[PDB]
Design an enzyme around this catalytic site. Sequence first.
Site: not given
Length: 444
Positions: A88, A97
């Site tokens: 991540e 994102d």
Amino acid sequence: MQQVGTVAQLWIYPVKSCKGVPVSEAECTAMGLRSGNLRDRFWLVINQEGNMVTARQEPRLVLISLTCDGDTLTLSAMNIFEMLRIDEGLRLKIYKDTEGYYTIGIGHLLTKSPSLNAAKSELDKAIGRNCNGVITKDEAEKLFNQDVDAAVRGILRNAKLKPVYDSLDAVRRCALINMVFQMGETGVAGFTNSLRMLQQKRWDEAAVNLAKSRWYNQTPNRAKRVITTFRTGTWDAYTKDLLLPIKTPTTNAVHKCRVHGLEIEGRDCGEATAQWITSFLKSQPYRLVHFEPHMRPRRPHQIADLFRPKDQIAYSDTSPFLILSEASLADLNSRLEKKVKATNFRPNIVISGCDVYAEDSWDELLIGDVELKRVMACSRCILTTVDPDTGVMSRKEPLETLKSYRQCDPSERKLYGKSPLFGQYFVLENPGTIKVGDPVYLLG
Ligand SMILES: Nc1nc2c(c(=O)[nH]1)N[C@H]1C(S)=C(S)[C@@H](COP(=O)(O)O)O[C@H]1N2
Ligand SMILES: [Cl-]
């Protein structure tokens, strides 16, 4: 004599400041617990100057485990938190994102709204301060711990995922949590065929099938790592475990090391271990050394004169043994918002069946055939705030709460100062073996 408790846990910390090894039985030696080739704080991480490296300097040492299966030592550092850190990343400013949604930290989605105001309002709510779109790493790790716990709680409440999760070994459980963290419960629950194959332990078939998914096509390098974890049940795609023999060649160098100011030798465990530790910690160059029994031990009596002149330790802080009771731990926990385990306090022997802080008045104990003698209380430090699962030091709790009520009596303030007392240091009067389940008898 009179039974005052029962042995509940035994812990050996082979490497100073690293993860404990739970055991059901252990030999009590004058220097501390022994189980086969593992002896308590008989390994030490050092820096280039030969000085100890402890979890005060490198709290992520607590993530490293050294275990032994008869013939081979294994070094390992992976768990779900480390796996997801790798996959991540870490960003301290609000970003978008790959789907365009406002996010921060370790993959923490703030909102799907296109409104930056909404993202910042969610951020300030989640952190509890005016962050103006920016957080610290400590704050990112706090949100991360919350998010991982939520993913696991969610799996356990999901009727499609819980049977598979329960069926998986510890490493493969992390791979399933990883997928849920990335794509959510409902998405992962849609992998009907792969989940069936996993529950049936058809690892190669599951791996082949998982690589055909939209998930693999969207994030193939991450999916390849997760799939390798499902296929093999190993950490080969992340920080791979290092396998070593028990016997270090005598051609390896002996280093003059320093532990809490005093000199002690150790045999270098080799370049493979040095590289592995240094890479995991992303640190300055460190080495691992091992104490061999012909080396000169450290002397607890030089550290605190209540210990006997004959007492000896390898790399432990002060004492051959630390004893703590469950009652003491439960009493502390009733005063804390975030509950802690015995692991934060790194005891060797945890005793059940007594009242709070009973061990503080147990001067002479018989456990199995072993006799132990109480020396003094254990005074605590910031290492108790280092979290055993995340490797993140709070620097606050539980040490503050202990400061509030466990300071030493005014009649005893030369030894301990204002460091709170929690647990007791003991030395050996008689060698032998102790076992979980052994009654603990108070002598005298
Ligand atoms: N056998 C033993 N256990 C012990 C101690 C000790 O001196 N001897 N010190 C305690 C304290 S005060 C600390 S902070 C940690 C240190 O663990 P480490 O030596 O593995 O870093 O061990 C705890 N458990
Ligand atoms: Cl990817």
